[PDB]
């Protein structure tokens, strides 16, 4: 029954496309297909590049009318009179423009400030919002002021004549909500969260590493308003001042290259940088220094009242009987950060499940402390 319909669907699309390919075939054509994953009522006529792929390159200029710009190993051929209109923007090549190398060839579109080819994680908006707040409370308050507020109300900052920082720093243990906090603002702030793992950027062969740093920044510039999330930069973050001793130079080159882009001629833009370190101490003075790093946002030993808010979050899912109060126990319990506070609770539900009861009890809670006290000490 379905089958008849499916056959009719191929056939109708086929006849219209055959006519279009016959036509497109004449005069040749660019890189070889259409992929849609936007809308067809918004179509670009600037396409990203850093090299010029050419396939024909038909154009209008007086000194010749089908001028080409390559740099490729075989056919690196170029314009016959320098700097005369060639690519037709991104006609017959889809990234034809100009070569980074240069041969005094025309630039309708630049070889820098483009997304180009990449290896990237861009991660569309999260879903999380408040999940360990209580001692993560301070960290929230400041992060909104730094990241969100400039994008929400920029016009205000200009009247005053103040410009906001470009980077903030995160430290303390990950997966305690140090980590959550960066995603939680990413979802609220509505700007693309771009996740680069510094350790990945590290490569087997030199110069490549610099190349990567550069590529990231060109993309970053184009899109204006974005967040670069650096996962535990210490691999190519500082430790280091020793000036080589055998490929401690290669990692240092990447670290120095990043500085160039930051301190350089670029300016901030709407670009925000979140850095992630273990203990901030590791990192070098150049990475610390103002005119790139200014605010360092911290974590902390959570006050008692705080613990309760986290427990309060947890208690909506967890079947309870409220006639007992967790805060009294919590004063007696070891002082520990947010992650252990959720974990003891999580342990508590299991004992119930064995007991063959569906509601929490005072009894469950007593048990959890003995295991947990043991677990840090292994």
């Amino acid at each position: 029954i379905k089958q008849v319909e499916d056959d009719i669907q191929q056939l109708l699309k086929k006849i219209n496309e055959l006519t279009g390919i016959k036509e497109s075939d004449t005069g040749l054509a660019p890189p070889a297909l259409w992929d849609l994953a936007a809308d067809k009522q918004t179509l670009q006529s600037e396409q990203p590049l850093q090299v010029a792929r050419c396939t024909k390159i038909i154009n209008a200029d007086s000194e010749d009318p089908k001028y080409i710009i390559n740099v490729k190993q075989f056919a690196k051929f170029v314009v016959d009179l320098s700097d005369q209109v060639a690519p037709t923007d991104i006609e017959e090549g889809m990234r034809v423009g100009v070569d980074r190398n240069k041969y005094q060839i025309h630039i309708p579109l630049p070889p820098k400030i483009d997304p180009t080819v990449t290896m990237m994680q861009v991660e569309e908006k999260p879903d999380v919002t408040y999940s360990d707040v209580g001692g993560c409370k301070e960290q929230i308050e400041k992060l909104r002021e730094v990241v969100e507020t400039p994008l929400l109300h920029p016009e205000r900052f200009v009247n005053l004549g103040i410009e906001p920082p470009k980077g903030v720093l995160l430290f303390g243990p990950p997966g305690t909500g140090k980590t959550l906090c960066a995603r939680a603002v990413a979802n609220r702030t509505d700007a693309c969260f771009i996740r680069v793992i510094g350790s990945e950027l590290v490569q087997k062969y030199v110069g490549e590493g610099a190349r990567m740093v550069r590529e990231l920044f060109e993309m970053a510039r184009t899109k204006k308003a974005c967040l670069i999330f650096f996962d535990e930069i210490d691999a190519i973050g500082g430790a280091r001042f020793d000036d080589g001793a055998g490929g401690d130079n290669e990692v240092q080159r990447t670290m120095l290259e990043l500085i160039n882009q930051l301190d350089g001629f670029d300016p901030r833009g709407n670009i925000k940088v979140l850095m992630a370190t273990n203990r901030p101490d590791t990192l070098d003075p150049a990475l610390m220094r103002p005119g790139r790093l200014d605010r360092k946002i911290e974590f902390s030993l959570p006050d008692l009242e705080g613990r309760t808010h986290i427990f309060k979050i947890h208690a909506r899912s967890m079947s309870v009987e409220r006639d007992i109060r967790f805060e009294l126990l919590a004063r007696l319990c070891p002082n520990s950060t947010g992650a252990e506070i959720r974990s003891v609770c999580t342990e508590a539900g299991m004992f119930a499940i064995r007991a063959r009861r569906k509601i929490a009890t005072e009894k469950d809670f007593l048990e959890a402390v003995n295991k947990v006290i043991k677990s840090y000490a292994k």
Partner: protein
């Protein structure tokens, strides 16, 4: 009759479509690669041929089955998409076997019982019961750590558990992730995670490493950089994304006091599982199953050999029998005698010790 009516115009239309594809399909058909996906009805392609031609895609194949960097078929002079290539290589990642439902069960070991309930409650139990996790509102632990002198029951228990649990088991050898090559080691851990995600739900058995033992107080060092570079990415994968069941982790280490608390991270791992030492009664239990398999005789005194034993786990025991069994086989008899048991018990005793005693605390 309703069917007939659809059928009359259809049959020809059905043939016509097949004729139309065959025109495209016509030999040869060159493989090439889609560089990148430019969503405003474009894409980047690298051709090792010469010509490229921007075409509309056929309706069998769509762009939703096109991924960046994919291999696709191009014609050699009209360079159009017939289909995407369906021929893919071997997982190139570090040593893995995947196995659905292994032979062995956990009824063969005995006297170890408590530990067996611990893994049970964590791994097996949520699969069995949705709604018990809903009441509580939480996940069973993501992962556990099994710690003891190398697999005498650690290893046994894992094999057993994969049959029970009825999902794909993937066992990875962790040392093998270590490479003295700058790119190789990180690429492997990221491929290891990639492979997990496809096969989900899945069980990850991590065989012990040297490299989870070292963190220092630097976060990377001028020493062997790679072992910590790798160690970090293990963490990032874990504290980035929590599974209730999509990935279950079994971790194994000889000693857990080598490990780092960074590595544990409470609220992923909450369970630390400890195999007790050899306890006297247990030795007899484990043994009774091993002898059953083998010939047995009415001059065997089961207790006497166990009594003579002290601080020996199941593996040596499984081993003693096997050794003795060989002697018998040389004699070409299937009868077992005391004598056999004595020589084998002596060989294994000879080899383990040369120490001096710290007893006599009385």
């Amino acid at each position: 009759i309703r069917n007939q009516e659809q059928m009359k115009p259809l049959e020809e239309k059905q043939e016509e479509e097949r004729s139309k594809v065959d025109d495209l399909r016509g030999t040869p058909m060159s493989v090439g690669t889609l560089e990148e996906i430019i969503d405003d009805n474009h894409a980047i392609v690298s051709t090792s041929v010469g010509s490229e031609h921007y075409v509309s895609i056929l309706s069998f194949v769509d762009k939703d089955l096109l991924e960046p960097g994919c291999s696709v078929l191009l014609n050699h002079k009209v360079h159009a998409v017939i289909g995407v290539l369906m021929d893919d290589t071997d997982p190139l990642v570090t040593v893995m076997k995947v196995e659905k439902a292994p032979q062995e069960t956990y009824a063969d070991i005995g006297g170890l019982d408590n530990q067996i309930q611990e893994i049970k409650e964590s791994v097996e139990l949520p699969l069995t019961h949705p709604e018990y996790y809903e009441e509580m509102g939480i996940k069973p632990p993501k992962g556990v750590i099994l710690y003891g002198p190398p697999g005498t029951g650690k290893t046994l228990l894992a094999k057993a558990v994969a049959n029970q649990t009825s999902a794909t088991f993937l066992r990875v050898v962790g040392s093998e992730l270590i490479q003295k090559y700058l790119g190789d080691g990180p690429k492997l851990v990221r491929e290891l995670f990639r492979v997990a995600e496809e096969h989900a739900p899945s069980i990850v058995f991590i065989d012990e490493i040297d490299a989870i033992g070292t963190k220092r107080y630097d976060s990377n060092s001028g020493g062997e950089r790679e072992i910590q570079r790798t160690m970090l990415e293990l963490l990032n994968q874990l504290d980035g994304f929590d599974s209730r069941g999509d990935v279950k982790v079994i971790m194994a280490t000889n000693r857990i006091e080598t490990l780092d608390p960074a590595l544990i991270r409470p609220g992923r791992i909450d369970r630390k599982i400890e195999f007790p030492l050899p306890d006297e009664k247990t030795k007899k239990r484990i043994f009774q199953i091993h002898t059953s398999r083998m010939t047995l005789a009415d001059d065997v005194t089961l207790d006497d050999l166990i009594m003579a034993k002290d601080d020996l786990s199941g593996a040596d025991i499984k081993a003693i029998c096997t050794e003795a069994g060989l002697m018998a086989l040389r004699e070409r008899r299937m009868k077992v005698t005391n004598e056999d048991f004595k020589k084998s018990k002596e060989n294994v005793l000879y080899k383990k010790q040369e120490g001096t005693p710290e007893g006599l605390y009385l």
